[model samples]
Target: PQITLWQRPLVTIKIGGQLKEALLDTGADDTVLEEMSLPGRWKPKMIGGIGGFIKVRQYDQILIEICGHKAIGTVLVGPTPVNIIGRNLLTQIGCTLNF
Candidate 1:
């Protein structure tokens, strides 16, 4: 689906068999999710945002569906205010910027 920058740039996505709304963040290099239960092991890491830095768990090989487009990659779980679908997954689904 096509999205215009004038809109919120939010889309419905499926992760870990659960459906959730996420922001399409081109500025982000990695996908970040709210604290949730995920399978497999993760390495602890700290990430900085607009406010400051926060702790997160880095999980590899995660499967997610973005508006019917499927992608597999790494996901970071932490105290994020909202779910962010970054360039990593966005590029896989052919997401692009438009004026």
Candidate 2:
């Protein structure tokens, strides 16, 4: 999907058979989702952020549908204010930023 840089690049994404909103974050390395549970076991992981680092659980091979495009990748679950569609899943969906 084509997104404008003038506004917050947020989109509707479906993860683990549930729908939610997320940001198309080119600045982030991994997809961070709001505290949610999935079917498989996850490993403890930490992602660094502004001010401080966040402790998250890393789930692999998670199916995420972003703006009608479906892809499977790692999803990090934590207490982020918004769900972030980072380079991990973005690359799978062929997401790019254009001028």
Candidate 3:
């Protein structure tokens, strides 16, 4: 199925066994999620963006489902304004921007 590019380029994805709406941000180097409860320990990491930088807790081996496509990898949770699905997961789901 072809993914639609909205004004915000948003998509519905499942993470941590929950459905969530996230932005498809090619500009983002990694996937960032809003603060959530997960049953694992994480290490602190810093991420820089257009605004500045933020502290994030990095979790490994997380399962995410996008448009029925499933992917497992690292996920960062912190004070992000919105949930973002970065290229790391996008490539796995075979998603690309078409115009």
Candidate 4:
């Protein structure tokens, strides 16, 4: 089946020492910052999940302003190979994705 969809322009957030554009994937629960795009030094942590815990690397908190709102959270290292936005934030905003 074919379907029409609407894609919104992604919002940019300043990381390290510059502002870079990132897709506004409300579907992504946790914010991801690319390792190559990061600067200075980073402290690593072990984030545990259902299958024990994975290495939860941490980075400097970047200021994020979106939809006229602003807040901060410790940026997380992107999954190896490629970065992705998962369905975390989308559920929080009560927004539905249509196909």
Candidate 5:
């Protein structure tokens, strides 16, 4: 589908059986999800961006479905401006910037 730049590219994704709406942010290298409870261990890391520096928890081996495509990788848990599906998962889902 062709989308005009006037609107944001937001899509619904499924993670851990929970549905969420997020932006397809190819510019970001890592997937960032809004604060939520996740299983397993995590490490602390700081990220710098337009919203300033903030600490986030890094959880690996997380599975997420983007528009029906599946992907598993590291996901950052924190209070991001918005839920973002970054290139890490984007590549796994075979997302391309096509016209």
Candidate 6:
């Protein structure tokens, strides 16, 4: 699939059982979902961030298929400007970095 550098592959996920979108950022250390988009039942713990510690949430590792490829990894919830996929998943899927 054709992908632009700096623009990673993204997928629409279910949050609160509603459809939500997130970017695949392999460079990131942890998977992050938007606070507003997280499921109501999910509870997160605080962790250290670039500026300070922040809450961390959890989700099931789902089969995310993209362009005939699939990635199965756990989801995390936290305060994010947007959704981001972290390294735990990227390495698990053996993702190829291409533009």
- Specify the highest-TM-score model's number: 2
How far residue 43's Cα lies from its native spot in candidate 3, in Å, is: 1.4
Q: Give the per-residue Cα lDDT of candidate 2 at 64.
A: 86
Model 4: per-residue Cα lDDT over 1-99, one tens digit each: 122345554555544445566655544456565665555567786543335655746665544443333555555674433343324433333446564
Rank list by TM-score:
2, 1, 5, 3, 6, 4
The segments of candidate 1 whose C-alpha lies over 4 angstroms from its true place after superposition are: none
Off by over 4 Å in 3: 4-6
* Model 4 stretches astray by more than 4 angstroms: 1-5, 36-56, 80-99
**Clashes per model (N, Cα, C within 3 A):** 0, 0, 0, 9, 0, 1
- Report lDDT (CA) for all predictions: 0.90, 0.90, 0.86, 0.50, 0.88, 0.64
The count of residue-pair clashes in candidate 2 stands at 0
lDDT of 1 by residue, 1-99 (tens): 677777778889998899999999999888999989989999998878999888899998989998899999989999887899988998999988876
What is candidate 6's lDDT per residue for 1-99, written digit by digit as tens? Answer: 446665556766554445667777766777776765433355556656668887687666544543344566667776786777677766765666754
Query: For candidate 4, which ten residues in a row score worst on lDDT?
Result: 84-93
Winner by TM-score between candidate 5 and candidate 4: 5
| Candidate 1 lDDT | 0.90
lDDT of 6: 0.64
Cα lDDT tens digits for candidate 5, 13-98: 99989999999997988899999988899999887878688889999999888888889999999988899999899899887787
Q: What is the TM-score of each candidate against the true structure?
A: 0.92, 0.95, 0.89, 0.47, 0.90, 0.60
TM-score winner, 3 or 5: 5
Q: Candidate 4 overall Cα lDDT vs. reference?
A: 0.50
